[PDB]
């Protein structure tokens, strides 16, 4: 019955049928994006209307459309033709991945480049890479992918070991034409293999790891109802999935006594971008918006038990649309489990003689996606004590280049002749806040040092200050780790028993934000990534920090456009957008397959509860 | 046979016998500190000499002594009388804890203060609190403790709920005299109880938590030999224990192929301080050096299976000296276990068709200590991929005060009338580095932004810079989170296969450092805490960032004195001292017993290995 239930195969097939019936999904049409829309504010009273949003591409060269369908009512709500030169190209289609290599394989310029390097065209893989927006006027309004080449010596070879530097091509994937082939000169193609399952490289596998068995003999402590509604240790939420954002959490709330208290209305990773810091023209255009351009949900892995997710696991298998509107299941695409998390609280008291220890646990909701060379795990955690956390785990194979003779200020060496250009992985978490309901505000809290003097004669005092962000113009904030800066989301109309507004505190990792020059294309297209925290007034059409159409789309949309409205955010329905990222100078240890590295953030209750919320946790 | 083995009960009894025989341990003498000394540099060649360092207090008022004993040879190596007014008082003795309350109970001034507040003296607990160094000239050369009062309504009551504000006393614990009683006025003693095992407060305990069973059917993957030598997944180390520092790691090394490669010679938490930020004269003197003044090892908890440490646990039970030189075992005082740590590396490749997933694990070595109201867990982690991490877990009961009518800039409210003064918990990790041996250097590495222009026409480039710290005068460094600042310890004489010096990178959390005014007593006594990173040239007598005797000791010793020597640290035997801490503005959720919060740091290999060190980890 829940309006927040996952899309079913039947709903997707029904959208297909509605579009077909309406004349919007003939044989030349392809679905580039399809997802369920969230219910409107105050929709709980009215009967449900399951609506789906669809981006439809046309392979014959006609203009694409944005369409909203009511699957409940069997109707098209709206359909509008898109001018992609203005509003952006549609996301990259899975079917376009192969096209770059295929077209290049019979292009005389490409073949000349490969022949100059004595490379067999049958062995040359070409990555289908998003193009961005640079100086090439002919690309405006065209669906372009750029191609970088990697040699695969045999079918099971890791092509990433053998980058073909000095060469890049640009391809129109609709007209099926190669627009440009740029050859700046030959570089040696690195020869060492990077085959991490080859015994020659691994050596004898370890026999020293004894089994770790994690079981729950009475099953898990969480329940799943309605397909995706989770209840666990006072927490209540719905686990959604979208082909763009991946796992999306809805209606995160905590049962405090008799009252179900909302905390976050919607939590997602609304964008992620990988900007590269190598000024070589072969890669200086490289910025992968894995979420906005590629759709990370689409490439979610099927996760194997005892391998990807360990313990007593409950899986969800979300359904997405293929290019033709047929449903496709991602079997075991979402993992859900609880795990022990060490000591929760402990005290051994010298006066009362009471010794007290309690254990912590967390609920984990995760997926793993693969975007070419990269593989990312997205993990949401709920803890017994009210803490909410997100963690991204970055692994896969590093994106490679040649390592220049005489070194580089922008590339590190991984193996003889093999380079890894410097880059960042920068995430935007969109948190549609609902601290005890929708009337919320944000304060920036800094530690305040105090001078020795009257009122502080020993020079020991310290304090803090809170500054309310009253309007969107004042709500674009930067980190200040030195002053312990955090941001508190509170409800000014809901007080705890000590007469203080209830709140949650966001604790950032204070990693560097976007490093690119502020006048670059990427600083404009990923403007969100230049600042740690943004707060907007909620609006139904302000979904992504980069806007709806990121592919080959200049600045003009997204967060900078939203905040120009300068709306009241002091005790209103607000959205926090937190930028956080990893700055990666690849190390030799990252090669030939990279150990996981992490980044994230958390929010902790801050006078939300009237005392510790875990006094009722039992011993042992 | 290992010279790094834990002290045995026999060794401690033998030190006692040697001291007795030498005339140094008569009936008026008490042992305030006893610990084994590490072997001298280059001692491996010579036969072993187990030496012990002892601080001996005299209850009759005579001067204390510092003594070094050779237990192997049955000799006193050295014995020197200490002038405590100059070099500092000895650590607080466990037997002195009760003395403050006992002396105050018959003092007319104290009784008058309690009577003004209608408090039964039999119900008033007095915390035995370190005194520091302030304006009281009579305290110089005397062993003083200060007393703050807390009412205990009945034997099992949590006295922390009932602070008696406006009152503090100072006591000479040797002459057994009350030197001062200060009463600045009555405050209401908060009345609500804080009894976290009382059903009235907890309510009905949860019945929703289903068991999590963690077992190892073939036992653990680590071995313990020689009592405390651990081998686990290529790692080699010795687990030491000292009554001051607690768990100390020695000889951390990694077996890379056939070669045992040193990484860290000695790792410890060499100090921890809890400075309070309330300018009230009742607490403005409050700074607890839990390590230096109280000795955190002494109060290590006995850790219960399935409660404190979960899984297949191997315990060590370290032996310490009581006040008379008799051995006392801390049963199950150190936990050792390995645990699963999620995904280690993962890639699903679109060209090779190979799908690869490997799991991570970490070895955990921990203890938990209790210092009055506070309880801290100290955790060291070794990971499969070469990462070394420390984490402190802070819990217990928050130190309380009255909450002032009309609020406070330096105290938060926890319950009606109940306050928690702001404070920090600041740790110093002393890492005696040995990256591939002892010839090491430290570089500070910052991200470098680049301007759009020639050589960077698209404004995408970014880089980094490394600055070698050549001498101790240049080696007192601060965090810069905005520029992604880290510190690399390398061996300039040991290169990896790419001809780059092998190294490890220290990743700090960049939390605020000491907030007190730089002219305060605490800024001088805890000078280490004002800066994030210090590097010294190794010396056998430079053990603690605060010197050997912290109790009632002014500035003059410790790190500022060590670095004045301005020694060469560029390719030498060096020591890194990392300051890291928690700044605590207590929340209502911290009351009546606080959920764990954490802080720490890690070091990751940085061109130490010739490729990923975990290619030989098997599937599943
Ligand atoms: C942004 N950026 C930097 C970047 C950089 C590069 C690329 C890029 O683009 C974005 C790419 C995003 C997509 C990434 C998701 C991961 C894709 C993985 C490939 C999908 C796939 C597609 C096809 N196949 Ru098959 N196969 C066998 C074992 C394991 C497999 C894993 C995956 C297979 C696959 C397997 N197969 C079936 C039977 C016998 C042999 C084989 C082989 C041999 C060698 C390779 C693959 N397979 N297969 C081959 C031919 C036809 C059909 C077929 C099938 C059908 C169903 C299942 C498996 N295979 C972006
Ligand atoms: C820096 N700062 C802010 C600060 C602030 C405040 C203080 C402070 O000082 C530093 C203090 C550092 C020391 C902290 C370490 C923790 C000390 C814990 C107290 C030790 C202790 C000391 C004594 N006893 Ru008992 N006892 C029973 C159960 C559980 C117990 C736990 C601990 C017991 C204890 C227990 N006992 C035995 C038999 C019957 C009843 C009892 C009771 C009842 C009520 C309380 C305690 N006990 N006991 C009582 C009397 C005589 C002997 C005795 C023993 C002997 C052996 C074991 C247990 N007990 C510093
Ligand atoms: Cu990376
Ligand atoms: Cu604290
Ligand atoms: Na909101
Ligand atoms: Na060293």
Curated annotation (Swiss-Prot), chains A, B:
Changing residue 374 to F: Loss of activity. It catalyses: a primary methyl amine + O2 + H2O = an aldehyde + H2O2 + NH4(+); 2-phenylethylamine + O2 + H2O = 2-phenylacetaldehyde + H2O2 + NH4(+). PROSITE patterns: COPPER_AMINE_OXID_1 (PS01164), COPPER_AMINE_OXID_2 (PS01165). Its EC number is 1.4.3.21. Topaquinone (TPQ) is generated by copper-dependent autoxidation of a specific tyrosyl residue. Disulfide bonds join 309-335. The keyword Phosphoprotein does not apply. One of its GO terms (molecular function) is copper ion binding. Induction: By phenethylamine. Its cofactor is Cu cation; L-topaquinone. Homodimer. Catalyzes the oxidative deamination of phenylethylamine to phenylacetaldehyde with the concomitant production of hydrogen peroxide and ammonia. Belongs to the copper/topaquinone oxidase family. This is Phenylethylamine oxidase. It comes from Arthrobacter globiformis.
